[PDB]
Amino acid sequence: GDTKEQRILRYVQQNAKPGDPQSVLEAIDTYCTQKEWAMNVGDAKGQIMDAVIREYSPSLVLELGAYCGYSAVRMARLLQPGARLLTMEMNPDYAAITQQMLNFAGLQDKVTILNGASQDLIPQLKKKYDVDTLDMVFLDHWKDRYLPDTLLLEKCGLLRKGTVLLADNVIVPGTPDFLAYVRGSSSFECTHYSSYLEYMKVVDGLEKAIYQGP
Ligand SMILES: O=C(NCCO)c1cc(-c2ccc(F)cc2)cc(O)c1O
Ligand SMILES: [Cl-]
Ligand SMILES: [Cl-]
Ligand SMILES: [Cl-]
Ligand SMILES: [Mg+2]
């Protein structure tokens, strides 16, 4: 039968307005509160994301892990005209949901999906995707990948002074190595934003880690 992700897409298509990102976010959050939990960033942490995006107005954002496109919708709706989001989604079924979610929201021209594993695609960003450096990175993929992929971004020359890392789920499921690393490194200036796990009365949080150079 259908998957939960297909059910979320369908709900959005039937309960949101085409081309209205806000209605799409609302539809997802309604579905996930009333029908079935799902691992979208959600509205609590989403509001914090929004506040960070507005502060920095990034021109080029990289997202690690798309899921159904909630966070990509959340971020892309607030980008300035001409700004871009690249999202890396290794799961092909998730990638297809995400594309369709973005298309329904009318944000397709702002966002590119890269299908494959972050560790494989990050080294291609400069030469294949014509990236210089990133303004912001949203980490929301497998939690054991946050640290290695941060170190890989640095190796590949993709971080500049002031690049904003924003990491989901630093408390649940948790990213203990990543947190220890960035909080102990003089190359990062970190802030913790305490919140709640999407759609649940369980504490979670976002970590912002601003790259300071070598
Ligand atoms: O696995 C995650 N992400 C990568 C695949 O898309 C993920 C997991 C959870 C979560 C799961 C199970 C639980 F019991 C609590 C949290 C939450 C999230 O926000 C997530 O991003
Ligand atoms: Cl999400
Ligand atoms: Cl992932
Ligand atoms: Cl929520
Ligand atoms: Mg998450």
**Which residue out of 168, 204, 207, 208 is catalytically annotated?**
168
| Closest residue to atom 9 of ligand 1, CA basis | 39
The answer to whether 43 and 151 have CB atoms below 8 angstroms apart is no
Query: What is the total count of domains within the chain?
Result: 1
List the binding residues for substrate: 143, 169, 198
Query: Is 140 one of the catalytic residues?
Result: yes
Query: Is 15 one of the catalytic residues?
Result: no
Q: Which residues have C-beta atoms less than 6 Å from ligand 1?
A: 39, 65, 67, 140-142, 168-169, 172-173, 197-198
Spatial distance between the Cα atoms of 11 and 28, rounded to a whole number of angstroms:
8
Query: Is 198 one of the catalytic residues?
Result: yes
Distance 8 CA to ligand 1 centre (A): 16
| Closest residue to atom 18 of ligand 1, CA basis | 39
CATH number at residue 81: 3.40.50.150
Relative to the CA of 169, which ligand 1 atom is closest?
Answer: 19
For 68, the domain range is 1-214
Solving technique: X-ray
The resolution, in Å, is: 1.2
From residue 86, alpha-carbon distances to 89, 105, 121, 211 in Å are 10, 16, 11, 19
The answer to whether 141 and 149 have CB atoms below 8 angstroms apart is yes
Query: Burial of 80 by CB count in 10 Å (0-12 exposed, 13-18 middle, 19+ buried)?
Result: exposed
Distance 34 CA to ligand 2 centre (A): 17
